């Protein structure tokens, strides 16, 4: 459970070091902070995801590292390590979807983020998002679908996942 | 649920090394990630299901070991090591044979380019980086039981070999710090399990009995491969074998071949005296329902064959007498036109003796690299004209023998490792075989590694210059000293303190000047390393409980340090003003400096004095007098003898300034250390003789002699029945 | 590229001698299992040495390799007086096959250091080399550690081969 966390940080840190030759300081802080403890139940889950949020949010970094970070988040929500028992999981998911809507960082990362939005919103945990965040989500998938410059297959990815989130949203009128 | 079995079969086909040409490295990376993320979800539960655990045990580890061996791409190895680390973390308990093979082999390649070694170090650091407990756990799974080879001790030795900056020539700079992190974490964690257990309370469980039994096994095997006759009797005396009968010897030799050296068994077994051992050992193997080539493979996989011919004749003659009776005989079903039938061949013992020699002939003639003239199938087939009750052999039979030997050798795999084509048999050979209590495991863990780690750390402490790494090294060394002191390991603790005392740069120009300034003082102040060394060296002194651990040279270094500190007027000599107050005497005569300037002559310039002031503040903060002498425990007869021996008897030209001062200082110390001393019957004569002999030194001013007479009467008050010395004093 | 056989009883002495011969330069990993197969160089000559066991049944298997072979070697120990009776039987047995007209025969009386080592003339008398004719033979004395005239024996082999070829 904690092995996978510093596993992911090891992978992203060595990728960053290979690519480079401000984020690594907090990354090693995450490494040292998660080294000691046994189980995640002691501490909050916003800080463990926070370096991933910082890398994915800002646009100064190329597609390799942000693709690796998005695959890391995919592994996170696939393995369900950020469980409801963990403290402040609502805030962690809210921050994840708030940062993820900014489609900034060629076309691989767009499909990775929109698949991640599908996996979050379709899941029951996606019911905990706020109205502003989910509205921004709908805005960014609409921007992806509307575009013509982008590849058409990415457009069909946006079309299908838009259909999915619309179904999930409109099921809530009961 | 069968779909899981088929899916893991498909991933076996993806990952396995046979399908190298028909797949891309991207596909292999994807397959690696697939089984990696599949393992995490139902990891331990795979133990319950036997077929899936077998699939994850034998073949997929063949794949993982083949990939880590002969891979050059960095992304491929990055994906490969992740699955291995997760499998060690989750399923490390059950499949530990493969883990031991992987760790020995990966550490073998590790200690031989730079980037692959860096990635390997960074990924294998996963195992210890989870928590310190794994580093203990591997001791109580791998090295404890006698069956498996040593891992953990080799782990520490290899890792601390790698931690040196000396590897920077052959490795990139990213390896040393992450290497050092594991050892630092281990020694830091070992300090955590110290507070609860008392020092005197601790000082064995069934688990450590295996470790005690193991250590003689290595020496026994070394003696055995040194020569054969000296090995078995000591071994039987130790009682590993049930008795001296040949049956028990065969029972040993068949089961635990991996421990022993194959060439030793090959040399011993062919001895013409031990034919009974030959017969008894030959019975243990099975050949029922197998072809002849599989029979020779089973014969020679367990032990190496001897080179010379008559020994092969003896060994195969031993083979035939048992292999003939092993297989039941049915003369009724003899046939020639039949194909792929084992029962059709029922050779007489001489016939199968000749055939068994024949496959050896084929292997040696064909596949020996030296022989230029390879064999031919037709002449080989004709060579066995009339060697089964004077009759020829089936064509398909000898054809299959020739095809089998052509496709694959007859040779043991363990020596001929590293080749790309040979890992199949080498892998297949192995799997045919298959709070107070916590501290007790760690004694042996220190006992093999304790010097080496310390030496490595001290090498870094000599090479490093940054403040942070140096102080981290110093506090880790302090915790190592705590571990040595609590565990009652004497020579090691002496090694740390002696190396520190060499490193502090106080144990061996410009004369002394007024805030004294000196060569030693400036050397102390300007250098940060010794500056931080002194404070730890006198922090460790305070906390010592058992004074027996100190050695002679350690005490000598202590008196040299305190004397050299007092030489330059750093430390005031009033360690025991309470003794003076009780005896109602004034303070000591401080040693004079050479020149005293108040505030081209060599005045110490303003840019030189700051080192002296920094040294002043550091030594004042160290609290030397309360450290060495203030604590009650350190007072011992060894300190008295070494201190009073270290007085300067003779007065050279140079030492005129501090001669009488140091002479008074030593005895002023020894009175207080005698007074707190519990027993006084024996050492009293020693201190009296040394002090009275020292009083007879000439040239002393009358002030110090008046001071010296005051001690003698107090000595004679304390010590017992020395009438002659009192008479000498009176006279 | 010629072949020579070698026959004896004591494995350790034969193996040590064989390791002693092959030193022109040693760059190798491991030999294959089975029989010892070794190389020996000399100025203008190179030779390959195989091993042979002596008994009735298997010596038929050694027959075809004799088509290219032209030489034979022995090793006989000094203080092994008991087992000369076993050795000379094998010596006479090797003469039994009649296709070996061109078989060069040698002896290496290993361990000629101990005081009870029988004389070379007495070695000939005991082995029984006098009462046979019609073939070439040679006898020589050598020591495992110190060495004595082994290269002279190889020179004799080379000169015999150049006399033949």
Residue numbers in the entry:
A (entry chain A): 11 to 31, 71 to 154, 162 to 230
B (entry chain C): 329 to 440, 455 to 545, 550 to 780, 799 to 872, 888 to 893, 903 to 987, 1004 to 1135
C (entry chain D): 17 to 181
Manuscript excerpt for this entry:
The budding yeast homologs of GBF1, named Gea1 and Gea2, localize to early and medial Golgi compartments where Arf1 activation orchestrates the formation of COPI vesicles destined for the ER and earlier Golgi compartments. Here we present cryoelectron microscopy (cryoEM) structures of full-length Gea2, the yeast paralog of the human Arf-GEF GBF1, that reveal the organization of these regulatory domains and explain how Gea2 binds to the Golgi membrane surface. Gea2 and its paralogs possess an N-terminal DCB-HUS regulatory domain and C-terminal HDS1, HDS2, and HDS3 regulatory domains. The HDS1, −2, and −3 domains form an extended helical repeat structure that is contiguous with the DCB-HUS domain, such that the HDS3 domains of each monomer lie at the distal ends of the homodimer.
To further investigate the role of the regulatory domains in modulating the action of the GEF domain, we trapped the Gea2-Arf1 nucleotide-free activation intermediate and determined its structure by cryoEM. The conformation of nucleotide-free Arf1 in our full-length Gea2-Arf1 complex structure was nearly identical to that of nucleotide-free Arf1 when bound to the isolated Gea2 GEF domain determined previously by X-ray crystallography. Strikingly, a closed conformation of the GEF domain was not observed in the Gea2-Arf1 complex cryoEM data; instead the position of the Arf1-bound GEF domain was similar to that of the open conformation observed in the absence of Arf1. We note that structural predictions of Gea2, its yeast paralog Gea1, and its human homolog GBF1 each adopt the closed conformation. These structural results suggest that binding to nucleotide-free Arf1 enforces an open conformation of the Gea2 GEF domain. In the closed conformation the entire GEF-HDS1 linker is ordered, whereas nearly 20 residues (residue numbers 781–798) at the C-terminal end of the GEF-HDS1 linker are disordered in the open and Arf1-bound structures. As this conformation of Arf1 is incompatible with the Gea2 closed state, the GEF domain likely switches to the open state concurrent with nucleotide release, adopting the nucleotide-free Arf1-bound conformation we observed by cryoEM. When bound to Gea2 in its nucleotide-free state, Arf1 is positioned such that its N terminus is oriented toward the membrane surface, and we predict it to be in close proximity to the lipid headgroups. Although not present in the construct we used to determine the structure of the complex, the N terminus of Arf1 folds into a membrane-inserting amphipathic helix upon GTP binding. The conformation of Gea2 when bound to the nucleotide-free intermediate therefore appears to prime Arf1 for membrane insertion: GTP binding to the nucleotide-free intermediate induces formation of the N-terminal Arf1 amphipathic helix in a position optimal for its insertion into the cytoplasmic leaflet of the Golgi membrane.
